[PDB]
Amino acid sequence: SMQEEDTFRELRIFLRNVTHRLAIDKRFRVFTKPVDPDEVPDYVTVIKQPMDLSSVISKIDLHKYLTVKDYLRDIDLICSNALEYNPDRDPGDRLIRHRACALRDTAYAIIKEELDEDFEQLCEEIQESR
Numbered sequence: 051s052m053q054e055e056d057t058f059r060e061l062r063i064f065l066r067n068v069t070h071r072l073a074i075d076k077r078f079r080v081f082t083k084p085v086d087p088d089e090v091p092d093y094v095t096v097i098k099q100p101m102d103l104s105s106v107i108s109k110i111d112l113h114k115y116l117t118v119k120d121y122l123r124d125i126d127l128i129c130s131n132a133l134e135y136n137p138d139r140d141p142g143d144r145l146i147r148h149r150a151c152a153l154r155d156t157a158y159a160i161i162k163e164e165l166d167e168d169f170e171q172l173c174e175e176i177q178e179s180r
């Protein structure tokens with residue numbers, strides 16, 4: 051319905067806002083774009099489902115997220131990808147892992163403070179009805 055479409059439009063507005071706030075954080079710069087095809091040639095062979103904040107934005111705009119839970123799976127993916135691909139004790143790896151965890155934690159904290167639980171429940175019920 052028109053009302054359901056307004057729901058989803060509101061969802062997308064909320065998700066763009068959260069995603070923008072993550073993307074402008076200097077700590078998260080490395081997650082803002084996909085990893086360069088040639089310049090890290092082994093990435094796409096270790097990491098089967100690359101994800102980054104620009105790809106999140108495109109997915110929002112393509113109406114791929116019908117719930118916050120679905121968005122958060124992609125935030126979780128950005129994180130798990132970073133922990134998987136940079137697993138070493140070396141400071142380079144430890145910095146990106148820290149930053150990945152901080153991205154995840156920040157997104158969850160923003161959502162905990164600002165997402166109405168009844169709004170999410172609605173989204174989930176509309177999705178489950180399709």
Ligand SMILES: Cc1cn([C@H]2CC[C@@H](CO)O2)c(=O)[nH]c1=O
Nearest residue numbers: 080085086090131132135136146
């Ligand atoms: C997403 C990601 C990026 N990098 C390096 C690749 C080159 C630079 C910018 O992509 O950061 C890296 O070493 N590990 C990663 O998990």
